[PDB]
Symmetry: C3
């Protein structure tokens, strides 16, 4: 139903000890990050927020993060989902903590929200109180700064982004131009915490107004 | 069935009045673009032709037009379809006029055509008699000249484009190298309106022949 | 079943005896290239290896080869599959022989292998003893040099690729960063023939290790 959470699921996890030099060269790892933590899930933007959360609780960096074409509902293999993330750390112990932190956040109640009765429209309006090292880098903001993580299908996102930018004292940091690999869109907006929360509410309200009137104009 | 029109559908339409300055920045709008018209549909190339049609009778420009990965049949949400287009204009009233023309054109009988009984192969063979400001820009021609808008699945398109180029006095203006986001392909060919129509007929004929014998010499 | 070959299927094949000058340019054919051979299939990496084999058995070059977004399981039309390849040759006889070699290789037993009982995870671990003109150029090595052609889903590929690089005296030539158009990943590794084979076996074993315990320490 409307306002129901779409629960994200982690599909696969694996840890690498002593990465090969060739692979470290490709992934441009820091010299003393000898261990990697791999993870896939069925929801990309939640996983991106979870990976950033992991950099806050463990001595890890996000070195790879990409979404799959057409989303998790169209995956052709068991573990592909719609996202792959790679954490790098000095040893499997740090990587293990990061992966555990990632999984806990994915299971913490955060996620996309359904906008109508048949769950055919959904959106992501997440206020990140304190960014880690990954979303702050992606957004070009100081680590620890707040951001609103806003994602929705193409038209809803463009309409709702305009509403969010006008409703709150926020600035655009990164634009997810439609289509992402999953055929969504959105942005990362920064500002004070209260402003990011106001933007999340305006974004969510705007997406709902499209779902209750998709063609009326 | 063969020769059936695949009816295109508009999924969502919205007008943004007084677009925020940072949105105008990311979208690279011009200082006189004050209102936006958003549209999604379940058929991308038909919508691109309609948006271009809108630029002839109204003061709107096509500022954004992108297709969705794997097409409308693989959309995960109700309104994503397989295309998003954005018109920019001086006021919401002018944008409304442009969108009205876009909707009328999408409902005018244009669309993809089926090449076989189960509609598992389809193609687009549209003669654009008089281009607007969008397709003319994309093709590198002057506004008001004609185009043949030819789209089909990868192999059919490469074969049928070759048939069209031999059959009519046209030149290649824009090549949609396989795959597009929707896993189709094609091109924009220009010439006289009769040459463009001859190219459309030859393109449609070639796609149908491939559908009747996909494994060629086997 | 685990270790079962995934049978690849060719979906369409077509020859063009004499390509028009316009298609010849946009497809970047050599002046002596007069004919084209088109092919689509439901498995891209097997088809790429087959096209490369064709450049060894016939006087043909691979001039176009691309994968479809989201793979063959998500194709919207009958013949799109997940790959289109184009061979070019001096006459229809060379193109025909090239296509025959391509088809013979696709049906030769090479292919993706299932990693678990329900065939929900599969991988490609193919040792190319002597590359033709296509995969050699793709990897940046001389034709005739050997390659390990390793493909698997994103997480499996990264783990198994790292495993392969440790197990053999090979170097990374081309990295298929996840996701490819088909939402797979892998790389082309070069070295001695036995070294490339050692990497292939190590890659396959590592993928199977993830498939039998996807959640790892969890
Ligand atoms: Na699908």
């Amino acid at each position: 139903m409307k306002n129901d959470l779409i629960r994200p699921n982690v599909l696969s996890v694996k840890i690498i000890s002593n990465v090969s030099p060739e692979m470290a060269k490709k992934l441009e790892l820091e010299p003393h990050h000898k261990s990697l933590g791999l993870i896939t899930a069925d929801c990309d933007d939640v996983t991106y927020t979870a990976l950033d959360e992991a950099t806050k609780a463990a001595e890890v960096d996000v070195v790879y993060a990409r979404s799959m074409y057409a989303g998790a509902g169209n995956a052709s293999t068991k573990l592909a989902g719609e996202v792959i993330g790679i954490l790098a750390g000095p040893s499997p112990a740090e990587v293990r903590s990061g992966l555990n932190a990632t999984l806990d956040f994915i299971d913490s109640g955060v996620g996309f929200v359904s906008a109508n009765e048949d769950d055919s429209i959904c959106y992501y309006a997440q206020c990140v109180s304190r960014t880690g090292s990954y979303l702050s880098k992606t957004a070009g903001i100081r680590e620890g700064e707040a951001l609103a993580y806003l994602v929705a299908p193409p038209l809803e996102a463009m309409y709702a982004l305009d509403a969010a930018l006008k409703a709150a004292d926020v600035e655009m940091c990164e634009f997810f131009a439609p289509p992402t690999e999953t055929n969504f869109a959105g942005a990362l907006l920064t500002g004070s915490q209260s402003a990011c929360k106001a933007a999340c509410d305006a974004f969510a309200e705007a997406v709902q107004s499209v779902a209750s009137n998709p063609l009326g104009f």
